[PDB]
Amino acid sequence: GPKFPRVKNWELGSITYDTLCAQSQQDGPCTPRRCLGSLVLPRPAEQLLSQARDFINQYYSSIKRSGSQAHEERLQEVEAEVASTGTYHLRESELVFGAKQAWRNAPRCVGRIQWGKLQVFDARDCSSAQEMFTYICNHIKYATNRGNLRSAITVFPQRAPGRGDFRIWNSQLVRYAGYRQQDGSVRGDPANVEITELCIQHGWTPGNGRFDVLPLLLQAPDEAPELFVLPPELVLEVPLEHPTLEWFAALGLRWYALPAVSNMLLEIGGLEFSAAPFSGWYMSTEIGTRNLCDPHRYNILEDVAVCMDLDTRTTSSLWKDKAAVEINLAVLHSFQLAKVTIVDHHAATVSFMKHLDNEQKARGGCPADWAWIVPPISGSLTPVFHQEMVNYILSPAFRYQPDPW
Amino acid sequence: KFPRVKNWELGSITYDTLCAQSQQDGPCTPRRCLGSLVLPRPAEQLLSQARDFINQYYSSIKRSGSQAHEERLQEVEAEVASTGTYHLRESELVFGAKQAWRNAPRCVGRIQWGKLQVFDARDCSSAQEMFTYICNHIKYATNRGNLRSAITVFPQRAPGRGDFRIWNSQLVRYAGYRQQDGSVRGDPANVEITELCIQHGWTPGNGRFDVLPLLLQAPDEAPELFVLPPELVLEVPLEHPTLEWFAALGLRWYALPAVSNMLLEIGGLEFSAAPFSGWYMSTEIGTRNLCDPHRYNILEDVAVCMDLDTRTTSSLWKDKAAVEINLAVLHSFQLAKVTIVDHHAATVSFMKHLDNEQKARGGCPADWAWIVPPISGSLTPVFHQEMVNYILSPAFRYQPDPW
Ligand code: HEM
Ligand code: HEM
Ligand SMILES: Cc1cc(N)nc(COC[C@H](CN)OCc2cc(C)cc(N)n2)c1
Ligand SMILES: Cc1cc(N)nc(COC[C@H](CN)OCc2cc(C)cc(N)n2)c1
Ligand SMILES: C[C@H](O)[C@H](O)[C@H]1CNc2nc(N)[nH]c(=O)c2N1
Ligand SMILES: C[C@H](O)[C@H](O)[C@H]1CNc2nc(N)[nH]c(=O)c2N1
Ligand SMILES: [Zn+2]
Numbered sequence: 001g002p003k004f005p006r007v008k009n010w011e012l013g014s015i016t017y018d019t020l021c022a023q024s025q026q027d028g029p030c031t032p033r034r035c036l037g038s039l040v041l042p043r044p045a046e047q048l049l050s051q052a053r054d055f056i057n058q059y060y061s062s063i064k065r066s067g068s069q070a071h072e073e074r075l076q077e078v079e080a081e082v083a084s085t086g087t088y089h090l091r092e093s094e095l096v097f098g099a100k101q102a103w104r105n106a107p108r109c110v111g112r113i114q115w116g117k118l119q120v121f122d123a124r125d126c127s128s129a130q131e132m133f134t135y136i137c138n139h140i141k142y143a144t145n146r147g148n149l150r151s152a153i154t155v156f157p158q159r160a161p162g163r164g165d166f167r168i169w170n171s172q173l174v175r176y177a178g179y180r181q182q183d184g185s186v187r188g189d190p191a192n193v194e195i196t197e198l199c200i201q202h203g204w205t206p207g208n209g210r211f212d213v214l215p216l217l218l219q220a221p222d223e224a225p226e227l228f229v230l231p232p233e234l235v236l237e238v239p240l241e242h243p244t245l246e247w248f249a250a251l252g253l254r255w256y257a258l259p260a261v262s263n264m265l266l267e268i269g270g271l272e273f274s275a276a277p278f279s280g281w282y283m284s285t286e287i288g289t290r291n292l293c294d295p296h297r298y299n300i301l302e303d304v305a306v307c308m309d310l311d312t313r314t315t316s317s318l319w320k321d322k323a324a325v326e327i328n329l330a331v332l333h334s335f336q337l338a339k340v341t342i343v344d345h346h347a348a349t350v351s352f353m354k355h356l357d358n359e360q361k362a363r364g365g366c367p368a369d370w371a372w373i374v375p376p377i378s379g380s381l382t383p384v385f386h387q388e389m390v391n392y393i394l395s396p397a398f399r400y401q402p403d404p405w
Numbered sequence: 406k407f408p409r410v411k412n413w414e415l416g417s418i419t420y421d422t423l424c425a426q427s428q429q430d431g432p433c434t435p436r437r438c439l440g441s442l443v444l445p446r447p448a449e450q451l452l453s454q455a456r457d458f459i460n461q462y463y464s465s466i467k468r469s470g471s472q473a474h475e476e477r478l479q480e481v482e483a484e485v486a487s488t489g490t491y492h493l494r495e496s497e498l499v500f501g502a503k504q505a506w507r508n509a510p511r512c513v514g515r516i517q518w519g520k521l522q523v524f525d526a527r528d529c530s531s532a533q534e535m536f537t538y539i540c541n542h543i544k545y546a547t548n549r550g551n552l553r554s555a556i557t558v559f560p561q562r563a564p565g566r567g568d569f570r571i572w573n574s575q576l577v578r579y580a581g582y583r584q585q586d587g588s589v590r591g592d593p594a595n596v597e598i599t600e601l602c603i604q605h606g607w608t609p610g611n612g613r614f615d616v617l618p619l620l621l622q623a624p625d626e627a628p629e630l631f632v633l634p635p636e637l638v639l640e641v642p643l644e645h646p647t648l649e650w651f652a653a654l655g656l657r658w659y660a661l662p663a664v665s666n667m668l669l670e671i672g673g674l675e676f677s678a679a680p681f682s683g684w685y686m687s688t689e690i691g692t693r694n695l696c697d698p699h700r701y702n703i704l705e706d707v708a709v710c711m712d713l714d715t716r717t718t719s720s721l722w723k724d725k726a727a728v729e730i731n732l733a734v735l736h737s738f739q740l741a742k743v744t745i746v747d748h749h750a751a752t753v754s755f756m757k758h759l760d761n762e763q764k765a766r767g768g769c770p771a772d773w774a775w776i777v778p779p780i781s782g783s784l785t786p787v788f789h790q791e792m793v794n795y796i797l798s799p800a801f802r803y804q805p806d807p808w
Contacts, residue, residue, distance in 0.1 A: 005442075007442075008443070012699075013699075021437045024436050028438055029438075030437075030438045030439075032433065032434060033427050034794065035432075035440040036408055037440035039791050042408070289784075296789075315747050318732050325721055325725055328724070332719050375782075377781055378723065378727060378781075379779045379782050381724065381779075386698075389441045390437050
């Protein structure tokens with residue numbers, strides 16, 4: 001009967017219909033002729049004003065004052081401001097709500113059960129690269145909280161007509177260096193070769209290890225980026241050991257505690273926050289499966305399998321699968337021992353199922369990107385594998401943006 | 406526009422041009438993607454699908470434009486104009502069935518697409534005849550463990566009448582018997598078909614691995630029950646290479662995956678009974694059939710036999726057990742000399758297939774959620790490969806249950 005996508009869970013046999021998707025104001029990449037759901041990156045006064053009104057309407061609905069006089073007065077305030085200045089500005093509580101709503105709207109995040117619990121640091125007063133650095137250190141200190149991690153976002157000033165952007169050049173606040181070698185290989189994280197080379201071009205004295213923490217390149221409006229070294233005491237890392245395989249610690253592998261995305265755009269009511277880094281805590285598979293075992297990342301599967309004495313000469317020994325499991329276990333064990341927050345892919349996906357049920361009742365749906373939500377090991381052992389998902393774009397949102405260089 | 410398709414492991418980029426030949430809408434729209442959903446929510450038309458298919462065929466043998474090509478289009482046209490339908494030549498049927506497989510977005514085994522034995526069963530007028538054909542298919546496809554891909558094609562749908570159908574979802578399936586206390590004994594996915602077999606006269610067993618009889622249906626007739634001779638049905642007892650207690654679980658699985666509920670569409674003609682088979686990829690058995698919570702659900706038993714700490718997700722007890730079961734499946738198929746492919750070799754060969762199809766057709770329709778295996782996803786190259794999903798014809802399609 002219902003004219004909304006029907007969504008089925010094949011493990012439980014239950015059905016829902018997503019009505020939320022009708023609030024999408026904006027096309028993804030798919031069409032009736034071809035699905036592009038698996039692509040990572042497929043590619044103004046009245047326009048602004050209607051984005052702004054929709055957002056203000058969301059905020060007033062969220063505080064149950066929709067249609068109220070404070071609501072119609074805010075709408076007028078906003079149009080008046082666009083009328084005379086081309087842009088407008090958010091009230092503090094509007095920013096807080098919009099930030100949370102952007103996380104809650106992110107289809108690619110499995111951690112969204114935590115969406116209501118986000119510390120929002122307003123850094124819209126920031127006026128220099130040096131001040132960005134202070135805010136960022138404060139953020140990292142707050143978020144890290146000695147291992148007991150707290151979700152957080154710091155919001156720097158919005159894009160402004162004619163004037164340059166605030167940008168953090170690094171893709172995350174904490175990243176490891178990647179040094180291109182003479183034999184064409186890479187030492188450290190190959191994902192970070194470009195930003196590494198950029199840091200060196202901007203005067204950084206590079207180290208030569210596999211786990212060198214990168215410095216930050218921070219750009220304030222209409223200035224060249226400036227370089228800032230994080231005090232090592234601020235950057236919590238966990239050395240990786242394995243609970244029974246005693247040789248595993250001898251590998252010198254490690255990972256940083258804080259996953260802090262710094263190159264995304266936070267869009268709220270048409271306003272564009274080009275620097276707005278946000279952080280949570282890790283799901284174990286991000287470290288132990290992707291960052292450590294992708295062939296284009298640290299690529300350690302074969303070395304670990306050799307240490308475990310597996311038959312790496314044939315696919316059918318399942319040597320990759322066994323090594324990857326042990327690496328994931330080491331990641332979980334080591335984070336637990338160090339009392340640094342982490343969540344395994346089972347607990348995370350169970351919690352995401354609870355999130356979907358919360359959001360079914362609250363908004364009638366939840367946009368979700370199945371390829372990104374299902375973990376990269378043990379897929380069908382998690383309940384999200386058996387759950388259909390509808391993917392669409394809502395605002396507020398975190399959006400990709402081109403690299404500043 | 407032609408979508409850009411990137412491999413994130415290798416940095417390489419292609420453009421799918423083949424998607425332009427899609428004539429048939431999927432579930433997605435610009436407002437929302439529905440690609441993770443399993444199921445979807447006259448004469449001129451048949452004639453254009455017919456012409457298009459005859460063109461694909463004459464081009465496939467290089468004789469595009471020839472006398473033979475024109476006379477064949479006119480035959481198709483003369484037949485439709487007079488009867489509202491037409492019939493395929495055996496050689497066309499063979500081509501169309503291979504193309505349907507080639508085109509199947511959810512199949513990771515398509516490197517094999519050109520090697521397909523096709524039995525024409527269009528001269529079949531009875532459920533009894535269907536049974537004989539099915540036994541021959543099984544015997545041939547199984548080949549004493551050296552499995553060979555095959556399809557048998559029964560008579561097409563016709564406006565005047567009921568369809569030929571095989572009620573079972575595969576030719577070989579294990580019974581699931583509901584217990585008065587809710588539980589299922591056997592394969593919970595086959596409870597309905599098991600019950601249908603019982604009501605049409607089957608004497609049920611009571612094991613966890615009882616091979617079902619087939620319900621075959623000729624048009625507008627009640628379906629009929631046929632027991633497969635047990636020697637036709639190759640099974641593999643599961644054991645583990647190092648864990649001796651694993652064989653004590655009494656697990657086993659059948660060699661032959663042979664889908665028998667899907668519709669084969671070729672040039673607008675529809676073949677409601679057209680069972681097809683290949684060989685398994687180990688994860689289908691090891692991960693989905695044995696470990697899915699709504700299938701035989703054995704993860705916990707295995708974890709306990711391995712003495713794992715089951716009380717917390719963070720021991721990765723599930724992951725550890727799933728890996729041993731998959732290992733047991735590969736080992737036991739290898740020991741019994743029955744064809745199987747593991748998920749690494751299979752996905753490596755699919756990458757090769759993508760590359761072949763890029764050169765041959767300018768693209769390949771693929772359903773990423775079904776191509777990427779259910780364990781160790783990102784350990785396989787297909788995880789890192791962007792894919793474009795779309796429907797080309799000839800095609801295998803879902804159809805309603807006949808009851
Ligand atoms: C609280 C713990 C959190 C967990 C466990 C978590 C987990 C994850 C995971 C596993 C991913 C996929 C990452 C990848 O494969 O590259 C992700 C993506 C994402 N999460 Fe979270 N998340 C958390 C908190 C946050 C917070 C606080 C925000 C924003 C306020 C957020 C926004 C995002 C976004 C935008 C993405 C997509 C990134 C992209 O497309 O590249 N998440 N989350
Ligand atoms: C030769 C070895 C073959 C292998 C290893 C293979 C592998 C697979 C696998 C793993 C799937 C996913 C199945 C599932 O999760 O339920 C699949 C689906 C499928 N394959 Fe194959 N395949 C093979 C041969 C064939 C042949 C011969 C045909 C047809 C002539 C075929 C047509 C299909 C179709 C239509 C699907 C989709 C089924 C559905 O939507 O439920 N494949 N294949
Ligand atoms: C290729 C690439 C693109 C892009 N936008 N970002 C990166 C690296 O950013 C890290 C990655 C983004 N998918 O996010 C990891 C993450 C973030 C958060 C907030 C929590 C968490 N557990 N995990 C690489
Ligand atoms: C729910 C359902 C639908 C349907 N069409 N078939 C089934 C049972 O068949 C399972 C599956 C098709 N989804 O077959 C697996 C398979 C088929 C083939 C030809 C090869 C292979 N390795 N594996 C269940
Ligand atoms: C091609 C494919 O879309 C790509 O490799 C995706 C798949 N799923 C993912 N899922 C997560 N969580 N993170 C990723 O980087 C990716 N990569
Ligand atoms: C909802 C989701 O699409 C569903 O669980 C799919 C996922 N991928 C799959 N992939 C294969 N090969 N077979 C399946 O049954 C499924 N199930
Ligand atoms: Zn789609």
